[PDB]
Amino acid sequence: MDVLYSLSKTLKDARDKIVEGTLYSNVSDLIQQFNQMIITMNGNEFQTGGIGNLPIRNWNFDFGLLGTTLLNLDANYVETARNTIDYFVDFVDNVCMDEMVRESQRNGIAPQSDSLRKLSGIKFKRINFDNSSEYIENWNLQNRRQRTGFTFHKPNIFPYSASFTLNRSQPAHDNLMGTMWLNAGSEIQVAGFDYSCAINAPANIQQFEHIVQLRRVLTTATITLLPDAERFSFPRVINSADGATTWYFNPVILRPNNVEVEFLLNGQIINTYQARFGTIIARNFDTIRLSFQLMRPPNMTPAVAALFPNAQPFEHHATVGLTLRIESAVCESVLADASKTMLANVTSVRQEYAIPVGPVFPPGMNWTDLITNYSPSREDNLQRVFTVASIRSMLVK
Amino acid sequence: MDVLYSLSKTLKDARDKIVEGTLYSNVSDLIQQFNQMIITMNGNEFQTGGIGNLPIRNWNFDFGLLGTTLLNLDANYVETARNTIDYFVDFVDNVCMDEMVRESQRNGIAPQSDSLRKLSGIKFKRINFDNSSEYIENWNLQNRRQRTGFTFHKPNIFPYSASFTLNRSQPAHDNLMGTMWLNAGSEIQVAGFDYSCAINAPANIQQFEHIVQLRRVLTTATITLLPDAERFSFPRVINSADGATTWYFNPVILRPNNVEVEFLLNGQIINTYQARFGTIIARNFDTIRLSFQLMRPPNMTPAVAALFPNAQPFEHHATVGLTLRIESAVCESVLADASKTMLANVTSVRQEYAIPVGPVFPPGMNWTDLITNYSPSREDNLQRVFTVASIRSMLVK
Amino acid sequence: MDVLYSLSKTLKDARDKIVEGTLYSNVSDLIQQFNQMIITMNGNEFQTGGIGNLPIRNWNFDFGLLGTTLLNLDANYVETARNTIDYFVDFVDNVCMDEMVRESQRNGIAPQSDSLRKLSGIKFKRINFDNSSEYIENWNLQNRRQRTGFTFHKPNIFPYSASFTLNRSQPAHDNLMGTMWLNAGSEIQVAGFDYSCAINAPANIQQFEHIVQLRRVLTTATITLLPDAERFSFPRVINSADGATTWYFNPVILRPNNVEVEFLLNGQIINTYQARFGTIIARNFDTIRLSFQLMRPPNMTPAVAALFPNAQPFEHHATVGLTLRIESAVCESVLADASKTMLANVTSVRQEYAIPVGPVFPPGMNWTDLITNYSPSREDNLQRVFTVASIRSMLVK
Amino acid sequence: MDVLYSLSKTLKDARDKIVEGTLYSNVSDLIQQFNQMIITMNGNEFQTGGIGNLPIRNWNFDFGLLGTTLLNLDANYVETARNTIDYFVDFVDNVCMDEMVRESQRNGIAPQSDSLRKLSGIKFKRINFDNSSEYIENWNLQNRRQRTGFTFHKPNIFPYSASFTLNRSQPAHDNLMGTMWLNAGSEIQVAGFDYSCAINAPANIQQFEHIVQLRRVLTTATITLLPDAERFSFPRVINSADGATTWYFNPVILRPNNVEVEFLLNGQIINTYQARFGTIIARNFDTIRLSFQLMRPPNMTPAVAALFPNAQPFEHHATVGLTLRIESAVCESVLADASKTMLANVTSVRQEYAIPVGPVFPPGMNWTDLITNYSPSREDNLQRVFTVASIRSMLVK
Amino acid sequence: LNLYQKKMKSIVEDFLKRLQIFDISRVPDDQMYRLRDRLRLLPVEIRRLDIFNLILMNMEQIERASDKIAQGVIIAYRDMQLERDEMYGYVNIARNLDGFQQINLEELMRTGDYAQITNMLLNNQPVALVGALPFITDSSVISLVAKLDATVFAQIVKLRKVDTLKPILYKINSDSNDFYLVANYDWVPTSTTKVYKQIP
Ligand SMILES: [Zn+2]
Ligand SMILES: [Zn+2]
């Protein structure tokens, strides 16, 4: 595997540092590495493809070295080189793709394809070099069993979930109390509603709570917390819990009272914030708990008083809410986020070549399904597959 | 051109690796490259500026070189060097800016300025070196007529468009049916409304559809699709299509029924998703088609039934919607996005120096106007201009 | 690729300049080139076919050189040569065909087949020669990214489109006003009709306009423009816009008034002609706009007056029209035209070998579909495929 | 002049036969010719442009000859060559264009531009070679005085002419007899009409005749002759001869009787065809005479009899016609046709550079005006200008 | 160092010899060359390498720094104004080519002549010659008047060579030149030619 990596940084730092002009001395250290490769390869034979709509292609090697002679580089030098690179590019592409499709339950971590299995061979190890590409960097550290870690912008930790829970309801759905939410990606919006505006509630306050359990721990998270859930601030006609009928939600929004956000790790409070809106840091957590209340306004102007009668019908439904967004965070496990193309690359190659559903990944590499049941096997396969996608993107985008 | 590039990575890898103390043998390979330059330059005269409020500064070359000698670097060594760098910096800045304003209908892809035209000369090619900066990387691969590609978080593919289409309307605007939307940047929000709540519609279902045609194909797109269009979930007073009067929109939101998103390429469905909210992948498309329906609730509690009478006046307007956001994608053409400063750099330099409107770009480099009529000439000029902005940002931010 | 080219001009200039008689001296320069080939080939092994109904064939090389001895040429010399040529002919045919079927989205420009991919190899480049064949000529100039260009007689730029637009209509379709047209290939015919003969129109003149947007710019176009649209000068029964009924068109033709043809490029008028019929030149345009009017005759003999009453029924329908034909033009992109057999060759080879529909080209290489959505990928594939067809036609027709 | 020619075939056979990989000996004979040029040139300086919007650029020569690195060229060899070619290309373009705009009444058959006048100088003749380009081929043969000759597809010999001649008419235009036609390009359509259907005509037959005089003799013409003039087979409202009113034409078509086509040369019948439709050959003619008759049907079914009463009003107008198209022909004088781009090239260069109207050519190089008054001066200038356009198209399209 | 000559054996021979162990000669030819083939593909002990990089950077400077030999000459068949420099006094030096073709003597000589130069000289055209070259100083005020500098050249063609191409300079100082009936008459130096030796 690491082998694979090199193959690319070789080509990149190649198709990059080798051009009509420059001095030999700037590539001397490079040129070498290169040749070294050609050698190890030549003589060997390969095979890629064979699954689904993926073409089968065989490759052989028999190439000349490089003129370690000149003081500068003449156009002619390049072209005779670029011609050799292009065969490797078109190669690697086919190599990546071929191993970017196969999955495996037992050992979903190690190589699969006839192409790569052959590379992990010892006789090729004579090629590793410059592993500064964030992903491979972490691939190694994990082999040696040590503390890994990646960086994500608007990570994708929450499987899509949009629902409600009626804590007080009745057939007519004319005096409900409960919460409704949307957990998706890196965002959570939750609203607590009480049709009665806490008219008969102790201290005229109704307590609400929303708990979200992450499938993986996030550390170093920069988070935006804002009062109100705009998504649940407008009139709605919703299906009843049993699907037998529809209820009416006509919200009027009040400020959430006694807001408390807790970021817990294994049941322990790691970070807690009381009514702090804006930017907050959650340094290590696997669970978020949002507690907030609706407090009936003790003093009301006529217009307000008119919305909240002492007796039904309750026509304006008191609602309080919160919005929480994880802007960035670090995770020890690979995840999809709003910036990296890994998930999209893997999903795209599989879709383009009509790769059949396998035993590990959900149909279509569906993110929600994947993160909902993020088993060790899915994670090992995902990491292998994401690391390969990242190796491929160094040359082919 | 590529020439230009070097000039910088030269200086950066210079103003960076040349510090009081470091061991020589870390820069041996570097030092060289440097000198090589000075030589090729010395004996040449340049001129930049001359347009709008851009000064016309003149430059000459005549410099000594650098001892190669010394195990480690002594402070004195640096300062005598930094003094030489600063003249090149202040130079390049003026060089970039001068070629970052001129546009040419004809060959808007070729060099313009007297300054650069002179660089593409052969006698200067002896300076090229280390082309790994994502942009130049793609500049080459294109000049050779090959497959390019870039990376964008929240790309800016949709020209601003905020409007509506009334499929059923009448003078009083008291029983409308149609859609309203906002396409902007990487996001689309669209709502379908039916004042009658499909009371007389076949199967009590009203079909809606929203089609958006991209000006450039996006591949590898990671997309968030969510039900509801919050932007169109509140009461509005809107101007009529003819601008003669104003209508009232008083939405009540229902879940979009039979949601189907199609990502098409040249009329062909490449990806299709049925009612799948959350994160989805669209691997290659030039068009997005969102189809969704409003289905009159077959069972209604009294509160709901009251909103939807059998006869007018229709006072609560049934609305269903969708929100789609392209988090990341790859495009073969340069585009503005939410992270890169290229567009802002080009636009800013032109604004600061009062550069007159030219024949290629819309006034103020207006993004909406640019992407709406993204001609080949505008794209070639944009790419040239974006690549220069990226070369400049390696040294001057 | 260029490699391929040679292979042929080699054979042509061979099966042509080598015959029972002539002097050595006329081929000396040639003979050489030839041998040079045999060498480079011998030892190598190939494979063509394997897709659809295309036979798989393997080829090996082990041939003797040529007697560079003799003065004149004796019959015997030829026959021993022709025998060697025939193996190459039957070869190339199979090579062309094999690469004339495969398509590819990502890189639809470069080679596909195992046969050709091997040719682009460096070790064969030792064969290029005499690239005066118009197509290869342009293939190169495009690699070096420069101004290309082809020549066409009755080009095929307009996708088939035959329709109408009723600007004034009513259920009975007894007093219509609008236009009907046929855009196909290199021709446009458009008619403007007004059942009322502009009886209530300002200045008794009805304005018409027909705009056609080319998918590619045409330069240097020689065009025939004639008044009248014969195709729309006869009685017709046509389907209504909604397909629910049929209307009657009973034209009577008048000369088009204030004819103005504009050939625009990116919205700018490049050429404009006012009422000029016959041969006109449009030097560079991507759009054609034809504007013409129907002017009610101010003076009418009884027979004419009788056709145009002050009140309905309107039984004779005043019609004015134009016919425009692009006889020849130059395009920077390959196109089908009325003389070249490229499209037909590619389409024919695919049909004969039952080649399955691929990811790039429309089913059956349908021209209208192709030109309607002439994407960059379709054009690159079309050019590759057209260039190969042209290489093949040098030997096999 | 001939000089000029070479300059190109030099470059073409150059930018063509000189590629990465061809054996030296395939260009030995060529290389030479090339160098020979450089020599003769270097030293002398030139001026192009200096008219309308045409730029005045100054060209100077200072080039090193061509090496000969043995055994097939190395990439490097090419690039150092291509760099030299590109200066000549960009040169010739400017040379052609500069002499492609100047006209002269007195001697408008010789070189005008300061650029070319200098080339006809003796010290340059040393370059001329391979005069196989059809146009130059004929340029020479004319300088010596001999049988020239060009080849055209759908030649453009007929100036646009669309009119009628009423042989019998009256104010009401209710009983007309005459002909109407369209002569344009290579086609003629003519119809003979008799509102009375020869009711009072001798032998119930009305004779018609249409004569067209070519401005230049056409030889070897392949012609399509078909009965009927579709263009004049539909109802029309036409302006009267004096423009004071409009008449009604309501044709009903009968087969033309006793059709006789004569192709005359200086008043002598060279070819004559009696009622022969399809493909006919006219080997040498300057005039075409079409004679045809309308013969009242001696036997008529009721439906037919009803169209042709013994007394006015005559409501169905008996019409007979012919269509003649010159598919191909040879002319001793240059002409525009449906395949060659010469006229379009000359017209386009003049339009692009805003070249002022001169003393020889009609405004806009209008074809109809040109061929209508095709004076010796216009022809000599046209030939010079067409020959230059053809030299230019060998390199720049 | 573009020494497209020795490279093969030359170095190899010395190499082996110093190794002592074996007596070259009986080293099959496929051996000695193959030995190079392998040698040429290795780094270079920083020491070694580090120095060459240094020599090359100053190479140019040395060459023009010498007292004998300058780089090429120019011919313009245009009465030209002699320049003046504190050190040489009144001389015809040019510190820069630019405006006249360049002809790599080395290239010409090594590859035979096609007279490209022969024609340019004959129809008398502005041209330059580049590389290292012989040299001649002269004090004969008169000389200049006699236009000697435009002579030497014709030569080359007859001999097909160009070694015998000593060009001329006029170290005309207001002194050591017995020939000074010059500043006594209103006048200005008309040198038809000058040279590249940059100033020390
Ligand atoms: Zn963002
Ligand atoms: Zn035709």
From Swiss-Prot, chains A, B, C, D:
Top-level taxon in the UniProt lineage: Viruses
Keyword Ubl conjugation: yes
GO molecular function: host cell surface receptor binding; metal ion binding; structural molecule activity
Binding site for Ca(2+): 266, 286
Modification(s) after translation: The N-terminus is blocked. Sumoylated with SUMO1 and SUMO2. Sumoylation of viral proteins seems to have a positive role on viral replication.
A Pfam family of this chain: Rota_Capsid_VP6
SUPFAM superfamilies recorded: A virus capsid protein alpha-helical domain, Viral protein domain
Chain intervals for the UniProt region annotation (Interaction with the inner capsid protein VP2): 62-73
GO BP terms in the entry: fusion of virus membrane with host plasma membrane
Binding site for Zn(2+): 153
S-S bridge residues: none
Main location: virion
Gene Ontology cellular component list: T=13 icosahedral viral capsid; viral envelope; viral intermediate capsid
Quaternary structure (record): Homotrimer. Interacts with the inner capsid protein VP2. Interacts with the outer capsid glycoprotein VP7. Interacts with the outer capsid protein VP5*.
Further details from the record: The VP6 trimer contains a zinc ion located at the center of the molecule. The zinc ion is not essential for either trimerization or transcription activity of the DLP. Zinc-depleted VP6 has an increased sensitivity to proteases.
Name recorded for this polypeptide: Intermediate capsid protein VP6
